[PDB]
Design a protein around this ligand. Structure first.
Ligand SMILES: *[C@@H]1O[C@H](CO)[C@@H](O[C@@H]2O[C@H](CO)[C@@H](O[C@@H]3O[C@H](CO[C@H]4O[C@H](CO[C@H]5O[C@H](CO)[C@@H](O)[C@H](O)[C@@H]5O[C@H]5O[C@H](CO)[C@@H](O)[C@H](O)[C@@H]5O)[C@@H](O)[C@H](O[C@H]5O[C@H](CO)[C@@H](O)[C@H](O)[C@@H]5O)[C@@H]4O)[C@@H](O)[C@H](O[C@H]4O[C@H](CO)[C@@H](O)[C@H](O)[C@@H]4O[C@H]4O[C@H](CO)[C@@H](O)[C@H](O)[C@@H]4O[C@H]4O[C@H](CO)[C@@H](O)[C@H](O)[C@@H]4O)[C@@H]3O)[C@H](O)[C@H]2NC(C)=O)[C@H](O)[C@H]1NC(C)=O
Ligand SMILES: *[C@@H]1O[C@H](CO)[C@@H](O[C@@H]2O[C@H](CO)[C@@H](O[C@@H]3O[C@H](CO)[C@@H](O)[C@H](O)[C@@H]3O)[C@H](O)[C@H]2NC(C)=O)[C@H](O)[C@H]1NC(C)=O
Ligand SMILES: *[C@@H]1O[C@H](CO)[C@@H](O[C@@H]2O[C@H](CO)[C@@H](O)[C@H](O)[C@H]2NC(C)=O)[C@H](O)[C@H]1NC(C)=O
Lengths: 46, 255, 104, 60, 108
């Protein structure tokens, strides 16, 4: 079943994962790409 | 609820929404032996409804309520209305003062976003504005101020301060009425039916004051001009106002 | 906030189509004329940090103010002119007209 | 109203380390496991510690 | 105050014009300011009917002055009779309306 594969994979990926350290903690910087989808601009108050 | 998988349904046009937590989270879960899961919760939603306020206050709108999954595209989550899907109650205890609930419909579409294609469910509530508050607030006052302006035509033309006072007071209160009437609407740029009615009333009262000014100007050169002018105004102002009322209401009602 | 430019680097995915939905925005009092995306770095006492900037240019619609302030003002000024046709003997009328227009 | 970067610095000899780095630049999440000062504003009325999209805090 | 105007000299045309129009505008101001104590309901309330009847009385006083001015200098006896009859009818009818209104809504 694909459920067992996905569960094993997700358990392995989160096996011993340190949230305190970023990707490439001591190495080069990580590049973050940003998208924005503006749904509304509500109230422009003077 | 927090221990099983729950779909990440959210409402797409909600400015803000909250669940209920008094006295406990207003939530219910039921699980049948075949694995079927029913999850219910009480919600209060402020949902945006872009109103086209042309024809205000005789304006009718379809306000939407759109929801979809936040992170699962159509390949992963599909929503479907049941036959008995959207049920309203008595509708009399609702908080619709300026509007009356006409009816509702449901729709389902597929929206393309930056992260995929998503099944989007919509409910449309039809709301028609009630013309009972703005009548009392604006239409009767403006009409009465126009009639008060007409009263100036039966005052003796020699009494300049009397008729000029009536004229200026009528114009100033029409200005105040215009401001008060506009205070209800958002600051839109286009013209609405209420603005039309108020502007026409203002034209009427200013035309009365201008008629008296002309009558006073012509009493020094040709009196019969003014003598006939007074009766002409007495007969032309109410007739023109009644005809404007007929045109205005027949237009804005059967439209 | 805490990562400097030797730890993290921002950019716009698509570099101009990173932002969507600006063309559909409905404001009853304004109009979105233009918008832009910027990429730069700022410096505080604690170091240098990456920065993205999204900016909009809002042009205010004039129609509301035409029907709300300018038309009443011009009409009051015309009402003030009306007194020039009243004869000087009718002092009370002209004074009432001018004073009402001024005070309003 | 005032919007500030508020910076504090102290010595905690319990946190000395030796490694390939001279400074550890840790997120807000680490500052919860160590002792931090309980600084408050005396004439403050109702303040905000911004946490969008994460707690706007930095520990080094 | 609108009814006080019936006890002025018929030659005081500016004075009675001021009386009439200022009382009518005061009634409009009071109606506009009283419509704010309520929510924006779509029906009329007892207070609305009372204000409407008061506005009718003030406007009727103004119309009565306009009539008696129309009949001065051409039928002075008619104007004098209309003023005399108004001085009695307007306050009496206002009292009658008040009794009826306050007995209707204070006994439900
Ligand atoms: C920036 O900082 C902000 C400030 O910190 C931050 O906002 C905070 O975010 C957190 C996390 O998102 C919020 O915490 C969650 O709150 C959920 C409920 O939220 C509503 O209610 C709170 C008040 O919560 C009280 O009431 C509920 C219901 O009555 C209780 O369930 C709570 O425990 C809590 O009760 C205590 O307080 C009461 C007084 O209020 C006491 O009377 C009571 O006795 C308790 O002492 C409101 O503050 C919220 O308002 C805010 O959020 C809304 C969001 O729309 C805003 O609109 C609004 O403006 C406010 O900002 C809101 O109204 C909790 O449900 C949730 O806890 C569950 O999930 C977590 C995560 O998994 C679990 O750890 C937790 O244990 C809970 O799971 C259990 O319970 C659920 C039932 O709800 C079960 O289904 C589930 O299976 C699980 O059960 C298991 O564990 C149980 C133990 O709890 C056990 O009993 C069971 O047997 C079973 O084993 C979570 O606590 C917090 O409220 C926000 N606060 C504010 C002020 O915003 C913001 O996110 C930050 N931003 C960023 C970008 O980071
Ligand atoms: C709204 O205001 C912002 C901020 O003032 C405007 O952003 C400005 O945009 C111009 C043109 O893109 C930037 O000029 C550029 O400067 C760099 C600096 O090296 C130069 O290399 C480029 O050739 C260009 O001249 C300017 O820096 C930028 N301002 C800031 C503070 O970053 C924006 O244009 C205004 N209008 C709109 C519609 O956003
Ligand atoms: C709500 O949505 C459902 C599903 O889209 C609609 O169900 C249809 O109802 C009509 C009866 O008028 C049936 O002829 C169709 O066969 C139904 N479709 C399905 C897929 O079962 C329902 O009409 C909608 N309710 C509204 C619009 O008020």
């Amino acid at each position: 079943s694909n459920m067992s594969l996905v569960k094993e994979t997700v358990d392995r990926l989160l096996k011993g994962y340190d949230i305190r350290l970023r990707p490439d903690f001591g190495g080069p910087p990580v590049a973050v790409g940003m998208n924005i989808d503006i749904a509304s601009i509500d109230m422009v108050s003077e | 609820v927090g221990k099983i998988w729950i779909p990440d349904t959210f409402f797409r046009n909600s400015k803000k929404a909250d669940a209920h937590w008094i006295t406990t989270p207003n939530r219910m879960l039921r699980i049948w032996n075949d694995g079927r899961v029913l999850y219910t919760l009480r919600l209060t939603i402020d949902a945006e409804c872009q109103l086209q306020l042309h024809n205000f206050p005789m304006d009718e709108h379809s306000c939407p309520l759109e929801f979809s999954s936040y992170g699962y595209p159509r390949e992963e989550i599909v929503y479907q209305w049941k036959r008995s899907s959207v049920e309203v109650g008595d509708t009399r205890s609702w908080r619709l003062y300026q509007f009356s609930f006409v009816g509702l419909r449901n729709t389902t579409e597929v929206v393309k976003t930056t992260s995929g294609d998503y099944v989007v469910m919509s409910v449309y509530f039809d709301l028609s504005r009630r013309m009972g508050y703005f009548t009392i607030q604006t239409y009767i006052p403006c009409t009465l101020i126009v009639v008060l302006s007409w009263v100036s035509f039966w005052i003796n033309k020699d009494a300049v301060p009397a008729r000029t006072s009536l004229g200026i007071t009528t114009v100033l209160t029409m200005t105040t009425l215009s401001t008060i009437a506009r205070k209800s609407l958002p600051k839109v740029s286009y013209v609405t039916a209420m603005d039309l009615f108020v502007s026409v009333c203002f034209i009427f009262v200013f035309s009365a004051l201008v008629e008296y000014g002309t009558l006073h100007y012509f009493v020094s050169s040709q009196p019969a001009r003014a003598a006939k002018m007074d009766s002409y105004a007495r007969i032309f102002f109410p007739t023109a106002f009644c005809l404007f009322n007929l045109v205005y209401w027949v237009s804005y009602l059967y439209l | 906030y805490g990562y400097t430019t030797d730890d993290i680097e921002f950019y716009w995915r698509g570099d101009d189509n990173a932002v969507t939905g600006v063309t559909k925005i409905e404001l009853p009092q304004f109009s979105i004329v233009d918008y832009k995306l910027i990429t730069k770095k700022v410096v505080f006492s604690t170091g240098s940090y990456p920065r993205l900037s999204l900016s909009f240019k809002l042009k205010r619609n004039i129609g509301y103010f035409i029907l709300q302030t300018y038309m009443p003002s011009i009409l009051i000024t015309i009402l003030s002119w009306v007194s020039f046709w009243i004869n000087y003997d009718a002092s009370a009328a002209r004074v009432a007209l001018g004073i009402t227009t001024v005070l309003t | 109203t005032i919007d500030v970067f508020f910076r504090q610095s102290w010595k905690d000899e319990r946190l000395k380390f030796k490694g390939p780095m001279t400074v550890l630049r840790l997120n807000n999440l680490m500052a919860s496991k160590i002792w931090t000062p309980d600084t408050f504003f005396h004439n403050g009325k109702k303040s905000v510690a911004h946490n969008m999209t994460m707690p706007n805090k930095l520990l080094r | 105050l609108s009814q006080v105007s019936f006890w002025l000299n018929r030659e005081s045309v500016p004075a009675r014009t001021v009386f009439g129009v200022t009382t009518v505008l005061t009634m409009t101001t009071l109606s506009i300011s009283a419509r704010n104590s309520l929510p924006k309901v779509a029906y009329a309330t007892a207070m609305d009917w009372f204000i409407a009847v008061c506005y009718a009385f003030v406007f009727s006083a103004l119309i009565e002055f306009a009539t008696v001015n129309y009949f001065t200098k051409s039928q002075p006896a008619r104007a004098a009779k209309i003023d005399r009859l108004s001085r009695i009818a307007f306050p009496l009818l206002f009292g009658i309306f008040n009794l009826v209104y306050w007995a209707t809504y204070l006994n439900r």
